[PDB]
């Protein structure tokens, strides 16, 4: 059925429309239902038997076994028909050398052998088809299971450090695929034992008791292999672990690369990554050594068994083997060797699949979530640690009114929102929803999908243009969407163009405002926005747009100024509600709280590269040693054939030495390919990481994180664990096939003729496959990436998926995507099997031609002996060549990144001319600075001239987009400085090597970036600082008491992204990280964006007292903060409108500073 599609590949590239829809019984829906029923039946037995964990294996079996039984039936028939070549060759040799007389005609037996071979190949391929069908069905079912699990796991699992979003991505990408491949190969595990045993029985029939000796030597494969497997298992587990850890670090390095670079710590984190990589490579080396030992055993136990059998026969049966007995025995030994070719692969994949299924079982047994709109009574909600973060929560969110939940950093605002939404463990009390009706949740950390602006804003609703315009204008996104490549259809989020923090937060708030649900939980919508955007959003989006619909709005804001427009105020302190009521009620009951609020408001070449990565000697050793090994093997076969055909101590001794050489060469050839693979993997990963780290920040901003992290994650896996086995099998099969053809052509010269036409045939089929395959390959890739993406974007932002209660829609989307990917992979496998079947028929034609040529004298028998195995090893050559082409494509992907640009770290000034303490006085002097982020972009900064005196506190304030951050980054030479000079303390910063300009200046970015590890690791990765310095910095940052009360102490774990602390606490950790460095110039960029007014006030006072001598330049979120500063530089569209003292610019009425101050 494929033939037509393959030939159509030329005229019309095969697309998903040329490809058909998946059958009814192959859809992910039905397979998922079946597997879920089986897994739940296994679960039922967990309660009956103590510690009886549900086994994914028995569920898989109950759901998809019978197809595997049919496949194994086909494989058994394939083996029984494969035990026909022995008889046919024996009869051919008997008759050529010389009603049961018609049958002995060598030509009749040649025809029968051809028929038996084609039938055997047909049955083997039928087994393969059934198995790949079952394996694809099972991959679909398991993806659906893990997805419906992701939609139920508790957020505490990711927040408390149990698992990582990266681990789930890894599950989906790698581990299910490995299980699928093992299932593809699984029938061998019970078809190879049967075949080898049956062949040993027939060897007993032919030779006699002698065969039993060989039989014993064959059975030793079973213990040995088992042992090997165990060790491999261990190694693999270790590998996995380290890999995970390493990737975690890599991921973080790629997300926080801007902070690492600005702090000059890039190399330290890179070195930690490299150490974890060294551990992973040690694990992989153990794995590879045991793989090579596996290959040695599988290839040498045949040789030793042959030696033992035939020497035992030489010294047991005085009667010599007649030529027919000899060739029958040698042919049976070849039939035994054939299954042992793939034994290494099956044991390897079975071990890896056992490990992957352990991981999948663990993940499928993880923790899962359990006029007043919402009335909470006596709630003690906790965040999974058994320690109540909210205690005695008594709240009432009145229907159709505005509830503002206000408190200082870490008072349970987001915690209370997620408690009402039910994402955190309940310990007492109840939440009454006058059974959660869908609530539109704007999370503190905005979560954007990979779709367009429009798709993110609508988010599962019909496009009502009136509502869309109203929302997009209330959020003030309209001036921002048009500047994008495509107005509203531009791709947002990861795998698309990256918006600024304010833009993304406003997309999130627009999404929340658009959905037609009765309740809207907005969590800190006014953090990234400046005063103008926030005020517009409040005055239109919340006070007007959401009050026309009478929707119940719950606002989590640090902006006390907006409290005057609130109907209900919930004041939070230390996880409890101090006071709940109207402004007047709080004024009467809690006088001091109202007074405090008032005070606060102041009121291929890739293949050659891979082979030669090992120094040009491992390639030579591999190829030469393999050639000599196979020379010895052919010599052994010829020795047996001739010695037994002609019919002594001489013969025994010669055969013994040949077999010993064969075993030694087996060892030598086994080690080479694995050593090559290890060397290449090490070199490739080292180069990739080094070149990524040293890249310019522009490269990271322009390119999606997806591509780089995909390289590191899943291309290194291919280079490590998939290229070496494929290459080894390719080389062995190709040598076997070339040697066969050579032996046949030397025995029967005329065979050369048949070789050329058939060769042509081979060529053509390759050609056709190699076009169609590629097309289908692309489809596979193009279908698989969205799928993974979906998983990712549902794992991250799960609270939003389950706050809007759009779980069903997302489940259906996943089902659709997995069905499409399954169609793609099914037809890729179909092209593969088309090629394999055509090559099998080509091989059968070779067997027939060689047979007929030989029939019309021991050399010509050996010719047929090899003709038989041509059929198997040609198939293997072709399959492995295709796989190797794909994996060399992966190698190409890795090698592509080695031509990136590098930041010019060298610099011009000799390090001697740079004083030991360069920023001593800390006197910045900007002269006519012009700055554009990338080449050929309008100058974000134009003609900036300012002179900051030593110890002159400077404020910078302007509308969002005035390039204040561009100056902040210009001090560190990240934005390209076309013209002008920033002379800091006597040295032009353009000359200094970057690691002296980045190292001696400290910046606090608005976005908090916390790296996984201890608090100590995030405050100083170098571990130089004394504990007292860390405590000093934490006290300045107003986080000393919380860390004192943290369990671990100053070693308390900080889960990935600092998710176990509130956003404000993350920002304060960043402030402390900047404070430890004790540099002389401190550029704080909106450092108090997420910090409430009280903590902001006290922290500003303390940071000003402690860093009085240093020069601090603060880009102010509130212009009120920098009113008391010696110098104030107000930017407006890249130009400094005025540069004077605070009081002077304030005195001049109708000025930009005075305007901002008045507002
Ligand atoms: C030698 C002839 C007769 C058959 C060739 C293959 C067989 C020897 C069978 C019998 C024992 C089987 C092996 C014994 C058990 C394992 C370990 C298994 O991994 C584990 O058991 C997990 C590791 C652990 O036990 O801790 C992977 C399959 C494998 C290699 C089996 C693969 C197929 C084997 C080698
Ligand atoms: N995802 C989380 N998992 C576990 N514990 C958390 C998580 N988020 C916060 N906490 C804990 O909750 C305590 C209170 O933080 P909370 O989540 O209420 O912050 P918030 O007040 O909403 O944030 P902000 O300071 O931005 O207003 C913090 O001490 C932190 O230990
Ligand atoms: N990573 C970037 N790459 C290229 N251009 C940028 C980048 N970030 C900001 N810009 C541009 O620079 C201008 C000012 O941005 P920014 O420096 O963030 O202002 P702010 O003072 O609000 O930080 C914007 O109008 C935007 O077009
Ligand atoms: C049985 C082991 C000896 C060395 C006696 N013979 C082999 N070993 C292999 N491989 N013969 C062979 C040749 C070509 C293709 N397949 C098998
Ligand atoms: Mg909050
Ligand atoms: Mg900014």
Residue numbers in the entry: 230 to 327, 341 to 612, 665 to 728, 744 to 912, 975 to 1018, 1028 to 1236, 1241 to 1543
Question: What is written in the article reporting this PDB entry?
Answer:
ATP-sensitive potassium channels (KATP), composed of Kir6 and SUR subunits, convert the metabolic status of the cell into electrical signals. Functional KATP channels are hetero-octamers composed of four Kir6 subunits and four SUR subunits. SUR subunits are not only targeted by inhibitors, such as insulin secretagogues, but also by activators, such as KATP openers. Here, we present cryo-EM structures of SUR2A and SUR2B subunits in complex with Mg-nucleotides and P1075 or levcromakalim, two chemically distinct KATP openers that are specific to SUR2.
To understand how KATP openers are engaged with SUR2, we further solved the structure of SUR2B in complex with P1075, SUR2B in complex with Lev, and SUR2A in complex with P1075 to the resolutions of 3.3 Å, 3.1 Å, and 3.3 Å, respectively. Additionally, SUR2 has two splicing isoforms, namely SUR2A and SUR2B, which differ in their C-terminal 42 residues. P1075 robustly activates both SUR2A and SUR2B28. The cryo-EM maps of P1075 in complex with both SUR2A and SUR2B show that P1075 sits in the middle of SUR2 TMD and is embraced by TM10, TM11, TM12, TM14, and TM17 helices. We named this pocket the “KATP channel opener-binding site” (KCOS). The C-terminal 42 residues of SUR2 fold into α7 to α9, which is part of NBD2. Although these residues are different between SUR2A and SUR2B, we found that their structures are highly similar in the Mg-ADP/Mg-ATP and P1075-bound states with an RMSD of 0.327 Å. Although SUR2A and SUR2B differ in Mg-ADP activation and KATP opener sensitivity, their structures are highly similar in the Mg-nucleotides and KATP opener-bound state. Therefore, we speculate the structures of SUR2A and SUR2B might have structural variations in the NBD-separated inward-facing conformation and such structural difference leads to the functional differences between SUR2A and SUR2B. Although we prepared the SUR2B + P1075 samples using Mg-ATP alone, while other SUR2 samples using both Mg-ADP and Mg-ATP, we found that Mg-ATP was bound in the degenerate site and Mg-ADP was bound in the consensus site in all of the structures.
